[PDB]
Amino acid sequence: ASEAKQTVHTGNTVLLMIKGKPVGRAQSASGQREYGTTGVYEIGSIMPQEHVYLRYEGTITVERLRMKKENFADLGYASLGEEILKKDIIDILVVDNLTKQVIISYHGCSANNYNETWQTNEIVTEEIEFSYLTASDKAR
Amino acid sequence: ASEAKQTVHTGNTVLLMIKGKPVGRAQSASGQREYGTTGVYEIGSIMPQEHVYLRYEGTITVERLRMKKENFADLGYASLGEEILKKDIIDILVVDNLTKQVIISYHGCSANNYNETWQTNEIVTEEIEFSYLTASDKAR
Amino acid sequence: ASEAKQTVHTGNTVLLMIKGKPVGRAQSASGQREYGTTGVYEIGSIMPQEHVYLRYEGTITVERLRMKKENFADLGYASLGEEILKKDIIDILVVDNLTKQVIISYHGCSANNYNETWQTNEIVTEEIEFSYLTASDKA
Amino acid sequence: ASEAKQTVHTGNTVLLMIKGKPVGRAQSASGQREYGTTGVYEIGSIMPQEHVYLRYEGTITVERLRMKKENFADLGYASLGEEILKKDIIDILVVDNLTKQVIISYHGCSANNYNETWQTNEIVTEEIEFSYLTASDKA
Amino acid sequence: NFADLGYASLGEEILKKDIIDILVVDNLTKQVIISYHGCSANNYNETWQTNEIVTEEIEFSYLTASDKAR
Amino acid sequence: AITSVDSYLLSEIKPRLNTVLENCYIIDEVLKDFDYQTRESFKEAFCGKNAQHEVTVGFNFPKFKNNYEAHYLIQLGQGQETKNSLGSIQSSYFEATGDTLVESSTAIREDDKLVFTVSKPIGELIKVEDIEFAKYDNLQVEGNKVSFKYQTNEDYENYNANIIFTEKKNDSKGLVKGFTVEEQVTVVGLSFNVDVARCLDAVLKMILISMRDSIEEQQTFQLQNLSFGDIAPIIEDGDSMIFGRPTIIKYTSSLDLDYTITQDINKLTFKERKDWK
Amino acid sequence: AITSVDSYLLSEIKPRLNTVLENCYIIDEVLKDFDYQTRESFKEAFCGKNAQHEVTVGFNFPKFKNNYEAHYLIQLGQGQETKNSLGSIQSSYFEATGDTLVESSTAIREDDKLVFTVSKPIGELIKVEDIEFAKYDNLQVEGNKVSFKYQTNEDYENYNANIIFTEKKNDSKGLVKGFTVEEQVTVVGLSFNVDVARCLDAVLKMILISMRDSIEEQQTFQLQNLSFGDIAPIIEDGDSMIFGRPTIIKYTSSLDLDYTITQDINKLTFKERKDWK
Amino acid sequence: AVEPFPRRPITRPHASIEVDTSGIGGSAGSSEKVFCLIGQAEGGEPNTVYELRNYSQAKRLFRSGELLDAIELAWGSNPNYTAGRILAMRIEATWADKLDKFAHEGGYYIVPLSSKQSVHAEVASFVKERSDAGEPMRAIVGGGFNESKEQLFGRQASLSNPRVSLVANSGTFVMDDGRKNHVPAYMVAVALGGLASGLEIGESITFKPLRVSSLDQIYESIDLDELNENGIISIEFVRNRTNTFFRIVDDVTTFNDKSDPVKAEMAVGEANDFLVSEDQFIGTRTINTSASIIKDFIQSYLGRKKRDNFPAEDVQVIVEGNEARISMTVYPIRSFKKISVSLVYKQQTLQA
Numbered sequence A, B: 001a002s003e004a005k006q007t008v009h010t011g012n013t014v015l016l017m018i019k020g021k022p023v024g025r026a027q028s029a030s031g032q033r034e035y036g037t038t039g040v041y042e043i044g045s046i047m048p049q050e051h052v053y054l055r056y057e058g059t060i061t062v063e064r065l066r067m068k069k070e071n072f073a074d075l076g077y078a079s080l081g082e083e084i085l086k087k088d089i090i091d092i093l094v095v096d097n098l099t100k101q102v103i104i105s106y107h108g109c110s111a112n113n114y115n116e117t118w119q120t121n122e123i124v125t126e127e128i129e130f131s132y133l134t135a136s137d138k139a140r
Numbered sequence C, D: 001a002s003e004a005k006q007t008v009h010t011g012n013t014v015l016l017m018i019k020g021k022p023v024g025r026a027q028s029a030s031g032q033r034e035y036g037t038t039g040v041y042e043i044g045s046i047m048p049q050e051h052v053y054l055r056y057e058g059t060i061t062v063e064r065l066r067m068k069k070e071n072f073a074d075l076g077y078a079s080l081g082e083e084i085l086k087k088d089i090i091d092i093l094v095v096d097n098l099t100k101q102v103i104i105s106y107h108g109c110s111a112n113n114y115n116e117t118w119q120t121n122e123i124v125t126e127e128i129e130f131s132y133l134t135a136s137d138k139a
Numbered sequence E: 001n002f003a004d005l006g007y008a009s010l011g012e013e014i015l016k017k018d019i020i021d022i023l024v025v026d027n028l029t030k031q032v033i034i035s036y037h038g039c040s041a042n043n044y045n046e047t048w049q050t051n052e053i054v055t056e057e058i059e060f061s062y063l064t065a066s067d068k069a070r
Numbered sequence F, G: 001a002i003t004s005v006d007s008y009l010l011s012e013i014k015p016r017l018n019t020v021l022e023n024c025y026i027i028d029e030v031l032k033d034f035d036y037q038t039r040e041s042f043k044e045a046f047c048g049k050n051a052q053h054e055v056t057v058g059f060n061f062p063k064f065k066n067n068y069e070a071h072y073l074i075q076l077g078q079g080q081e082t083k084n085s086l087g088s089i090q091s092s093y094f095e096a097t098g099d100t101l102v103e104s105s106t107a108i109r110e111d112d113k114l115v116f117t118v119s120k121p122i123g124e125l126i127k128v129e130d131i132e133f134a135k136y137d138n139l140q141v142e143g144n145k146v147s148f149k150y151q152t153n154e155d156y157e158n159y160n161a162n163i164i165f166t167e168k169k170n171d172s173k174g175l176v177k178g179f180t181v182e183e184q185v186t187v188v189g190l191s192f193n194v195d196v197a198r199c200l201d202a203v204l205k206m207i208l209i210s211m212r213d214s215i216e217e218q219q220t221f222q223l224q225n226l227s228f229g230d231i232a233p234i235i236e237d238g239d240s241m242i243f244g245r246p247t248i249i250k251y252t253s254s255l256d257l258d259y260t261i262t263q264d265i266n267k268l269t270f271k272e273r274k275d276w277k
Numbered sequence H: 001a002v003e004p005f006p007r008r009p010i011t012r013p014h015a016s017i018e019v020d021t022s023g024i025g026g027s028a029g030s031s032e033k034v035f036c037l038i039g040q041a042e043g044g045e046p047n048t049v050y051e052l053r054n055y056s057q058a059k060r061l062f063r064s065g066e067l068l069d070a071i072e073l074a075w076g077s078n079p080n081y082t083a084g085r086i087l088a089m090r091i092e093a094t095w096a097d098k099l100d101k102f103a104h105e106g107g108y109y110i111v112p113l114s115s116k117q118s119v120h121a122e123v124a125s126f127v128k129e130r131s132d133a134g135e136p137m138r139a140i141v142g143g144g145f146n147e148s149k150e151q152l153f154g155r156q157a158s159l160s161n162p163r164v165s166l167v168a169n170s171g172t173f174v175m176d177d178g179r180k181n182h183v184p185a186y187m188v189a190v191a192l193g194g195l196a197s198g199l200e201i202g203e204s205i206t207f208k209p210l211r212v213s214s215l216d217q218i219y220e221s222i223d224l225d226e227l228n229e230n231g232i233i234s235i236e237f238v239r240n241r242t243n244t245f246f247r248i249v250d251d252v253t254t255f256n257d258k259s260d261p262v263k264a265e266m267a268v269g270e271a272n273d274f275l276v277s278e279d280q281f282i283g284t285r286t287i288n289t290s291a292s293i294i295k296d297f298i299q300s301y302l303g304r305k306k307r308d309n310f311p312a313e314d315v316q317v318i319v320e321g322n323e324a325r326i327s328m329t330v331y332p333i334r335s336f337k338k339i340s341v342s343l344v345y346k347q348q349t350l351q352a
Helices: A082-086 B082-086 C082-086 D082-086 E012-016 F005-021 F024-030 F036-046 F194-211 F215-219 G005-021 G024-030 G036-046 G194-211 G215-219 H055-061 H066-076 H096-104 H117-131 H149-158 H185-198 H221-229 H266-274 H291-308
Strands: A014-018 A026-034 A038-040 A050-052 A057-065 A090-096 A102-117 A125-131 A134-136 B014-018 B026-034 B038-040 B050-052 B057-065 B090-096 B102-119 B125-131 B134-136 C014-018 C026-034 C038-042 C045-052 C057-065 C090-096 C102-117 C125-131 C134-136 D014-018 D026-034 D038-042 D045-052 D057-065 D090-096 D102-119 D125-131 D134-136 E020-025 E032-047 E055-061 E064-066 F056-059 F071-083 F089-093 F096-110 F113-117 F122-128 F140-142 F145-149 F160-170 F173-190 F222-228 F232-235 F242-244 F246-261 F267-274 G056-059 G071-083 G089-093 G096-110 G113-117 G122-128 G140-142 G145-149 G160-170 G173-190 G222-228 G232-235 G242-244 G246-261 H003-005 H017-019 H035-039 H049-052 H086-090 H109-112 H138-142 H164-167 H171-174 H180-183 H235-238 H245-248 H315-320 H323-330
Touching (some): A050 B102, A057 A102, B057 B102, C057 C102, D057 D102, D090 H291, D102 H291, F005 F024, F005 F056, F005 F071, F005 F173, F005 F194, F005 F215, F005 F246, F024 F194, F036 F194, F089 F246, F096 F122, F096 F215, F122 F145, F173 G222, F194 F222, F194 F242, F194 F246, F215 F222, F246 G194, G005 G024, G005 G056, G005 G071, G005 G194, G005 G215, G005 G246, G071 G246, G089 G246, G096 G122, G096 G215, G122 G145, G173 G194, G194 G222, G194 G242, G194 G246, G215 G222, H035 H066, H035 H096, H035 H185, H055 H066, H066 H086, H066 H185, H096 H117, H109 H117, H109 H185, H117 H138, H117 H149, H138 H266, H149 H164, H149 H221, H164 H185, H171 H185, H180 H185, H291 H315, H291 H323
Parallel strands (some): F056 F071, F267 H323, G056 G071, H035 H109, H138 H164
Antiparallel strands (some): A014 A090, A026 A057, A038 A050, A057 A125, A090 A102, A102 A125, A102 A134, B014 B090, B026 B057, B038 B050, B057 B125, B102 B134, C026 C057, C026 D102, C102 C125, C102 C134, D014 D090, D026 D057, D057 D125, D090 D102, D102 D125, E032 E055, F089 F173, F096 F160, F113 F145, F122 F160, F173 F242, F173 F246, F222 F246, F232 F242, G071 G173, G089 G173, G096 G113, G096 G160, G113 G145, G122 G160, G140 G145, G173 G242, G222 G246, G232 G242, H003 H017, H171 H180, H235 H245, H315 H323
């Protein structure tokens, strides 16, 4: 089927964007979300009477091939040392490659960890994990 | 054997339905159930005298390929942010594809977590987990 | 003498048609089809108890001499580069040459691979393979 | 002179029958069969102690020239599309041509794959493969 | 089987077992290679499968081991 | 059936050769690659309704003298059986079917049906030209007539069609038993003028290409394959030489017989009998 | 056995040729593809009970003149051994078995059994036509008779059947030792009329197709394969030429001998003997 | 049949109901084995067949005669079984014209209350004439007060018929009035006919007891074997126990043949008289067939059926003239006459 006619999104149908510039060499992104959903129980039944949401948490992980320029460290989206204290929260967008309409925004991303690996006969890799405040179907 | 004559259910013989609409692109569903079964012991024997049920718990997980429209987020069956607080519990049905007779209902599903993954050269995937109150051979 | 009670199709008896044009100089067409038939086994006997169909799959492969005009690339059915992303599915018909009557239809064809071989003592050969959604015949 | 004390079956001696009709222009039939024979080993010797049968499997493969009528698709035994889901199992009989006496029966056949090849200097060929539940002979 | 030979237990009968010695022995000479002394069962396990040989597994704790028989 | 490739070729070539030779622009197209004078001389001599010379076709070994100016000699060649069926069953039938036929016909109204009449009993209908009927149209065949519902079709009350069908001999069961043979026939265009031999070669190749589409060698005589010999003197010791260029036409075809089965079974019956031992 | 393909073909062709030629509609079906006048002339001359001409069959190199109007000349050809068994053991038997036979017979009551009588001692019974017996029926064979329980079968007290069986020579053990040979025989229909040669070719091909189903070449002489030569003058310097079209019939068959074994062992016996060293 | 409602047809717009009752019909089971008697009585209107249902009704219609004693024995030999209907007729010489009256009275066993051999031959002829028709019957007969073995053999040979049994012994019955009534052997035949009528369909009177006070003659084992082999029923005085009783040795028939149970043994003949007997695919669906592929097809069919719910050695197929007869063997329920015990003494090593 034509890319204009596929019913499912695929890696070529989407773009990853930060501060309005496309993230090159992006290999993967993984978005996770938890609500702390907890079941309530009482004397007289063995079964949960209802479920309630307690604590939202979510993390977005991004993995890339390390470029010779415009790395996360070079672009200022990642930190190696004290400079982490001088970063501020950022918004990460996943965007329709055809229309440039936003598909998902992650709001208020803040880095959890940053990782690099060097190998004899392979492309260098970057991986970064951000915790985020909220997500939405739309830009802020 | 003809589909009308198979003794075992297979993926093509069943449908997954929510609020009376078929869930498209469904890849898998996994249903788990625990009763808290605990053995009672006493002085004078090394062996359990009986087993008793204490606490029912169950979760239903659904995994899909992410569609360009009618996602769980688009259909309102999943939440990304504060909107989780404004959801309410839903019933998920697994249904005979020939007769549209219900095979299993899961009652009072409430979301535990929601997950997305983007890849260079693969179809985008959704996974969602609901805790539920009860299950039955029949609709509510 | 011409008898219907026995007759077989032959390379001369069958037209290949795409979008209502016959494909000139087609050398072969190969249609393949699979149902994923899986046998059911259980404790208590070594015998299969049942067979179930689980996954339909099929392909149509066409070999053709590369014409100077109206190649699969010139016709637009093949793709050399990123424009593969802009080709809608096409239906390939195999048609009786005498009666102009459809023998088998391959519906929803989508290209897997495309080859060209340039060689010094031979005519140039195109070959293309499509995945298709279903096949049918009507009578 | 005609002797029974030695005789072998040959392509001319054997009919192939499905649902009580002979299959015209059948070119070959290949029956294959497997029992999963597994050897038992133990500490104390390198020798096999025993063999056990664990899983029966078998297939019947038929090649045929594609007739203009009464194909496996026209007969309904083959399937081109989703209607494979509506075909009941069929029994394939191999029968002595002289005595009309059953040589071997393949019971509960179910189609694995179906092929057609269209080629420019040849007669068109059908080929089909079935899994079957069991085979037997009666005498 | 271990259950048939009385080297394993399924229920209360475990209480009426007593400790056993298990030997690993040279197949040519029948000289002992290792003795495990005072073996007592920890767990016993069975598995049934559609198209495989049935398996037994047993674990014993033991008191001591030696190059020689008791 | 049993078949005779030589007599088929004679019967097929003669009318086609006549109909090309009576039609000047066909020859003018066939000979477009030849030298201008060769083309014009051939067209003047042998072609058109006023042509004073004539071509001829016949089998080898006649007892009389032939038209050695231009003559197609047909010459039955070798063959061998190539492919066999299991049990030699080429096919089976519930109703003894004859040759395939194509006939022109016109619709007529009869009792608020449309009908097409055919010269012979229809053993099987393959195609009514340019029509595909719906179930509503209540298509039925009976004897030598095809019948077709009038109600919605009144505009077609005189529609002209071609019917492709096949005869029936009789209502009987049997097995078509036989095998496939690959067989050769040679054809040579004799002329004492070499340029006439070369033109007769071109015309024959055109005729055979045109023949490949005919029902006769679509249903039988399949896989026509052509080979060509050198141009050479066929006879060398007259007052002049006679030249020709052979062509070999090879065909694959079925040789078979209708083995009718008289045995028929129309009722099973069941009985239980008791064993007191 | 040792076999003689030429004498088999002569014995098989002659009656079949006669029975086709005495039956007009068979020829009318075989020759349906020939020219109308060829067909009618052949049918007038050679066919039907009133036919004044006749066809003939015989081996090559006779000392007398033949019916050169229409004559099938049979001509034994080459062969070679093709497949061998390990130890050359083609088979083994516990009871020396003769040729396969098919005979018509009728049931009769005898002492509250039904019996079928056969002309020769039954070495093995292959099939009683259209009957499959149950164990209750107490099927037994004895000498040259087949016997069958009457009690439940009284309706069949005069039932008519065909018995397929094989002779026994004698009660002896042995090994059938031998090999397979692939062997050729040529047959040509001679006529001084070319259209008669072509019709004799068609008739012979029909006869061989019909022959493929016979017990003789189902049990032996398997895998009949046909090749066809050109039509040519066989003799060229009489007052007229004699024409023919050769066909080569190739058969695969077994050559073997009954090596009887006289050795038989009917008791083992055991003894213990003591070694005092 | 299917009933239309309304019964009248209608063409204007309407609804009509068609009722299929056939899923509920019943009473299709057998007759009971009604018992039949003919003989002397007072009071009753001669040559009229009366149904009787209890002894009081019998004494109300018939009186003061051997038919009423017969009805007494007919319900007195089987006190632990259902006392079913009896058909009885006072006969005031040919007897066929009277026996004709039973022809359409639905009763299975008959006994004439006479020892005269002409009577017995007439009754056998009547039983034949009925049983070759659609309504099977049997008869039982006996001798006088004491007949020799050679007389009994001569009688059986003269009366040798597969639907007649002769009883040899005679004896004394205690009647319900307390009378020690000495009776000829045909009243013992009435008693056996009563028992056989009381037993289930294809039960057998062998080794059933006879409630008789004494017998005129006691036969030793060799004489019991002689009478049994000649197809004559005899009564054994069981002496091997303190609880002595009289036992019916066997249900043999005056036609004796080793080659057919159905004519030798009364109970299997009755089963055959009362037993009950219990899909098509047509050749147009196939190009050609044979008995071999018919057999293999029907074997595959019944294999599938018996898997959902037959031995290939036990089905026979004959094809003739476009018709195929498929014949199954089936096994009916017989009754044991022989028990063979092989007793093997082994010995065993005990250890402790």
